[model samples]
Target: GLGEEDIPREPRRIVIHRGSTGLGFNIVGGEDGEGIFISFILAGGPADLSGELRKGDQILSVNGVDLRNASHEQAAIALKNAGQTVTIIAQYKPEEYSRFEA
Candidate 1:
């Protein structure tokens, strides 16, 4: 992977099956208390099944529903309402973690 940045293009469009409610992911309000942030994705579940998610990925929209201006609960509802196959368009905000020189 290039060190320049993460998600170098547009937000990712991911589709995952339900009961996938977790891969032990931590979803919280986004920077402005709007969308949900995938704080972390633990192993041994759907998160790994798709390999389409990450630590800081934020759900900008859920199944074509724009959540940028929606409340956090609304975002959660959308995800819950997406039914079987959940399609999410998300933005990745790199974490502020320590880095070692390569």
Candidate 2:
């Protein structure tokens, strides 16, 4: 998995909002296949209402900005400092799920 192009690509897309967008669903990630992961999704939240957002899902990009190499702060800022809504490209690990994967 390198710049050469063997790296696995993420292609899932989910859109969520804030405010009437509903409370808030938290997401987290680290440095492994270590990528952006969904921390949790509010049950009655609008994010979940929008569609299927697997808990612990790996977030591949934010608003079209690939977060594959982004730092924690940068990722946060990307989300907090976006438009009225956001489109995220993400996926989930079936075997490596951290209890959050659904």
Candidate 3:
């Protein structure tokens, strides 16, 4: 049976202001309403400077949009529509392989 807390990590709510170059992060996953993950961060970018977002962070929500059931395109649009100041709810997963545990 599926269970609550299927993912056992704590969530971090991070608010980051987009830089002149934008949020400055790349995302992966989220196909078929799965989950969205930060693929990488641009050096010295808003997300990099924020010291909040990191590579491999599982993005749960953008602003107020839950991405747990969002597709790749949907998640991309959500981040694009996030504007200058965006609130992100994410789980910090250290390694790429580690994320496979869930």
Candidate 4:
């Protein structure tokens, strides 16, 4: 382990279009720990085009639906069923700046 501060950035509200294809982003977590986070982002996809999302960004909500405590399955279903042009409220926590000292 290491010692350092894990500072979380302010929440960002960004609107992303799913397009006719799909949202083109994947998420992980949301089962127990904190909130769900984006796991993958497809290149040239809606999320990529918006340039607002990135891997490790915590997903707070989608179009007013709460994903913070949503189970994996619930989140999946909610995202899949969410209509095109969804608004995302997310927070980015800076990567752990691990510091080791003697």
Candidate 5:
């Protein structure tokens, strides 16, 4: 479970699982631009229990940093700095959302 303190504040980017079946996005274009999306599995505690967080929610930014152009380490740092209740802005791909529904 996610405590209030575990939530990140201003979280912009997150790690994305490309072929994660749990989220269910197909590799229609051979991993170049087609597959699962991205989402925050854990802000600071627990995994897969937080509401609205998934593996295929495209991470747009982190603390305002655009993840599309950010390095792995940079994204990690941003997520680390994000405090409780991090505000993650993302779009839930249809497949990912369906997983949540299921």
Candidate 6:
């Protein structure tokens, strides 16, 4: 298995683009673990496909470390320490999807 630290950092921010919607989710913060904020897609950006990752999901921990007590700077440091491809545990609001048949 590859570790989070093993993932190289791309100059472009991490995002989820849906069809022609363009860039979605911008991933910010360090790989080690720290102050990670996953914001909503900017206007005109692609819509998120994963119902699990919502707009306001607060990243509680990265790879299993609670960040509630971490300071802004500490969070950043933690993020760097977290390595790459972290396993984030977050709290997200409920989602309701409507399916249509052709």
Taken over the whole model, the C-alpha lDDT of each candidate is 0.66, 0.67, 0.79, 0.74, 0.43, 0.43
Candidate 1 residue pairs in clash (backbone atoms < 3 Å): none
* CA shift of 81, model 1, Å: 1.2
Clashing residue pairs, backbone N/CA/C < 3 A, model 3: none
Q: Write the per-residue lDDT of candidate 2 for residues 57-98, one digit (tens) a residue.
A: 677788889887777677778878767787888765544556
Residue by residue across 1-102, what tens digits does model 6's lDDT show? 222533222211222324443334443433333234555555544435533344544456655667655665655555456543445565432121111100
Model 1, range 11-90, lDDT digits (tens) per residue? 77888776644433557764454456776676766766688787667677878998867876777677667778778887
Misplaced by over 4 Å in model 5 are 1-47, 94-102
Model 2 ranges off by over 4 Å: 1-10, 20-23, 31-33, 99-102
Model 5, residue 95: distance off in Å is 7.1
Task: Rate residue 95 of model 4 by lDDT.
Answer: 55
Clashes of each: 0, 1, 0, 0, 13, 14
Who wins the lDDT comparison?
A: 3
- Best first by TM-score, ranked: 3, 4, 1, 2, 5, 6
Candidate 2 differs from the real structure by a C-alpha RMSD in angstroms, to one decimal, of 6.9
Worst 10 residues of 3 by lDDT: 1-10
Residue 84, model 5, lDDT: 42
TM-score for each model: 0.71, 0.71, 0.80, 0.79, 0.44, 0.40
In candidate 3, what are the lDDT values of residues 34-91, reduced to their tens digit?
Answer: 4788878999998888877766688989999989778889989988889989999988
Distance (Å) between predicted and true CA of 76, model 3?
A: 0.9
RMSD to the hidden true structure, all candidates: 5.3, 6.9, 5.7, 6.7, 10.9, 13.3
Q: Ten consecutive residues with minimal summed lDDT in candidate 1? A: 93-102
